[PDB]
Every structure is written in C-alpha cells, then in structure tokens.
C-alpha cells in the first residue's frame, strides 16, 4: 500500500493514483507576493461552538480526531465557500525535525507541521458523495511552528501513548477544536486536492496566514507514534507530508489587503 517511505511515498503514488499528476493537486507553495486580495470573498465563519468530538484513531499514516458529523454541529461557511461545510475530522502532517513537516509552504518556507480541519459540503449528503464533486470538501489548514506550548493541543498530545500503532483508537469526547486556532483568520485560498491517496480534486483549501506555536515537547510526542501495527518492527511516524505540487492553471487569493 501507499505510504511515505522511499519505496511507497509521494514519488510512487502516481502509478496507482494517476491523478497525482493532475491539474489541481495539493499542496502547493504559496507565493505571498503573487497572491492577490480578492474582494469577492465573504467573511469567513468558523462555527465550532457545538462540536462533538468522538474518537482518535491511528490510521497508519497520521492520527484523526473524529467528530459527529451526523448533523450540522461544527461547520465552516463564508470566505470562498458556497453553502455549509461540516467538520468531519482533523489531523496533522509533521516532520522528523522542526525544519520540515508542513505540506503547504509559504515563499518556499517549510513549517514544523500543518493541521488540517476537514469539512464536507452538506449539499452532497455524505462524505463519499462529496468526494465525487469539484466543491465537495473544504480543508482549513493551519501551520505549526515550534516555540511556546499550545494549551489546546495538550489533550491531543497526552492521548497519543494510547494509540501508538496503526489501527489503535481511543475515546476522545469533549475536545474543543477552537483551542487549535490562531488569533487571526487571515487566509489564502485556492482549489486543490486531497494530499494523500486517492488525491481527489475536490478541495477548496483555506490556509491561515498566522501559524500557531506549539512546544518542542508537544511535537516530539507526535514523532513517537508508529506507522506500523502492534508487534511489528518500529517505524516512527515522521515525515508524513507530501511536497508542493505544480500550481498549473491556478491563482491563490488572499482574504487580506
Ligand atoms: N503507488 S503506491 O504508492 O500505492 C504503491 C507502490 F508505489 C509500491 C507498492 C505498492 C503500492 F501500493
Ligand atoms: N490531508 S487532506 O486533508 O488533504 C485529506 C483528507 F482530509 C482526507 C483524506 C485524504 C486526505 F489527504
Ligand atoms: O467539550 C468541547 C466543546 O464541546 C461542545 O459541544 C460544547 O458546546 C463546548 O462548550 C465545548 O467547549
Ligand atoms: O482579467 C483581469 C482578471 O484576471 C484574473 O486572472 C484575476 O484573477 C482578476 O483579479 C483580474 O481582475
Ligand atoms: O477531550 C479529549 C479527552 O481529553 C482528555 O484525554 C480527557 O481525559 C478525556 O476524557 C477527553 O476525552
Ligand atoms: Zn492532511
């Protein structure tokens, strides 16, 4: 199966997922000087007050914090989006060292990690239907840099010892994802794809300009997770990021002047 190693990583994915070489792949480098303010963007609304987290899962690639998306409880609206997008899960991508780990880059700069809050367009009824549509998903991306600790991340960090290996899950109720957001909602947006197989071109990306700070100790705990299953030789879960892909016939728009 696909992964991040030398023999099954991003440079190999195209052989089973030919869309890997497609016209709107993600992530991309965000050239901050070429990105243009877009007055047609509406105010962005992140409405997570009633979010219901359920479970945290090590899926062998990353860990997902899953939400009850059976009804409109945490949603994303506004900005570039037409209609209502429901939060289904969040996860991260990170590096083996602080100097890499993000998927998007900013003027070629790599951050230590990147948080993805994944939402599906409720007009399509379910996630599987949404990923058949050009506007099926919206992913809110947030960069992580290493400095002061992020208090709202600590509950995540502290459960990771219980989901060390692929296929393990744990209860993760009553987690507030609002504690993972920076102060500012300034953002860049562009049309793209899932960054892992199946690489489907369904995503409106909304990437916040302001990174959150996390402590070295917090990201070191991410790096103690395992790609492998229980009992198998240890492969540390690190460098689970896809590099930037060609921008092709796209423009990145900014929410800020
Ligand atoms: N294309 S891919 O990354 O999914 C892949 C490989 F490259 C190699 C082996 C199995 C496999 F699934
Ligand atoms: N990393 S990402 O947010 O683009 C993403 C998802 F949300 C869901 C599935 C695959 C995937 F790649
Ligand atoms: O427990 C995490 C969050 O869950 C939500 O459903 C509640 O409405 C919030 O008040 C709370 O912060
Ligand atoms: O033709 C002019 C237009 O070109 C487009 O590529 C830009 O996105 C618009 O902002 C601009 O008004
Ligand atoms: O909020 C997420 C989780 O944080 C802590 O692990 C709590 O002990 C647990 O009860 C809760 O589910
Ligand atoms: Zn992701």
Q: Which residues are annotated as a binding site?
A: 91, 93, 116, 195-196
- 24's CB contacts (< 8 A; 6+ apart) are 191, 192, 193, 201, 248, 250
What ligand is nearest to the CA atom of residue 35? 4
User: Which atom of ligand 4 lies at the shortest distance from residue 251's CA?
Assistant: 8
How many domains, the chain? 1
Q: Which residue, 53, 45, 50, is CA-closest to 74? A: 50
Q: Which residues line ligand 3 (CB under 6 A)?
A: 49-52, 174-176
CA 161/CA 157 separation, integer angstroms: 8
Q: Which residue, 152, 167, 186, is CA-closest to 43? A: 186
Q: Which residue, 237, 240, 239, 242, is CA-closest to 195? A: 242
Q: What domain range includes position 243?
A: 1-257
The distance from CA 4 to its chain's CA centroid, rounded to whole angstroms, is 16
Task: For residue 216, count other CB atoms closer than 10 A to its CB.
Answer: 12
The structure was resolved to a resolution in Å of 0.9
Q: Which residues are annotated as a binding site for substrate?
A: 195-196
What ligand is nearest to the CA atom of residue 94? 6
User: Which atom of ligand 3 lies at the shortest distance from residue 176's CA?
Assistant: 2
- 244's CB contacts (< 8 A; 6+ apart) are 27, 28, 29, 103, 104, 105
Q: Which two tokens stand for residue 216?
A: 């070295």
C-beta of residue 118 within 8 angstroms of C-beta of residue 67: no
C-beta of residue 17 within 8 angstroms of C-beta of residue 25: no
C-beta of residue 98 within 8 angstroms of C-beta of residue 112: yes
Q: What is the dihedral of CA 106, 110, 112, 113, to 10 degrees?
A: 60
What ligand is nearest to the CA atom of residue 5? 1
Task: For residue 45, count other CB atoms closer than 10 A to its CB.
Answer: 13
User: Which atom of ligand 4 lies at the shortest distance from residue 253's CA?
Assistant: 8
Distance 49 CA to ligand 6 centre (A): 23
CA 244/CA 29 separation, integer angstroms: 6
C-beta of residue 24 within 8 angstroms of C-beta of residue 52: no
Q: Is the CB of 139 under 6 A from ligand 2?
A: yes
Token pair 């998306």 is at which residue? Answer: 69
Distance 196 CA to ligand 6 centre (A): 7
SS3 letters for the chain?
CCCCCCCCCCCCHHHCCHHHHCCCCCCCEECCCCCEECCCCEEEEEECCCCCEEEEEECCCCEEEEECCCCCCCEEEEECCCCCEEEEEEEEEECCCCCCCCCCEECCECCCEEEEEEEEEHHHCCHHHHCCCCCCEEEEEEEEEECCCCHHHHHHHHHHHHHCCCCCEEECCCCCHHHHCCCCCCEEEEEECCCCCCCCCCEEEEEECCCEEECHHHHHHHCCCECCCCCCCCCECCCCCCCCCCCCCCCCEECCC
Method: X-ray
Ligand 5 binding pocket mutation candidate from 155, 156, 171 (most atoms within 8 A of CB): 155
């Amino acid at each position: 199966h696909w992964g991040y190693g030398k023999h099954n990583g991003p440079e190999h994915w195209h052989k089973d997922f030919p869309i890997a070489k497609g016209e709107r792949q993600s992530p991309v480098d965000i050239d901050t000087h070429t990105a243009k303010y877009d007055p047609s963007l509406k105010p962005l609304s992140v409405s997570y007050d009633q979010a219901t987290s359920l479970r945290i899962l090590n899926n062998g690639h990353a860990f997902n914090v899953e939400f009850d998306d059976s009804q409109d409880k945490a949603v994303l609206k506004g900005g570039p989006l037409d209609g209502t997008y429901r939060l289904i899960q969040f996860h991260f991508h990170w590096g083996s060292l602080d100097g890499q780990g993000s998927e998007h880059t900013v003027d070629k700069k790599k951050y230590a990690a990147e948080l993805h809050l994944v939402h599906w367009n409720t007009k399509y009824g379910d996630f599987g239907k949404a990923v058949q549509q050009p506007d099926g998903l919206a992913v809110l991306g947030i960069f992580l840099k290493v400095g002061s600790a992020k208090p709202g991340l600590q509950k995540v960090v502290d459960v990771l010892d219980s989901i060390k290996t692929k296929g393990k899950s744990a209860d993760f109720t009553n987690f507030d994802p609002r504690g993972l957001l920076p102060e500012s909602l300034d953002y860049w947006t562009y049309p793209g794809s899932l960054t892992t197989p199946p690489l489907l071109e369904c995503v409106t990306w909304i990437v916040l300009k302001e990174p959150i700070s996390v402590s070295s100790e917090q990201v070191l705990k991410f790096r103690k997770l395992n790609f492998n299953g229980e009992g198998e030789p240890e492969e540390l879960m690190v460098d689970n990021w896809r590099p930037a892909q060609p921008l092709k016939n796209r423009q990145i728009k900014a929410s800020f002047k």
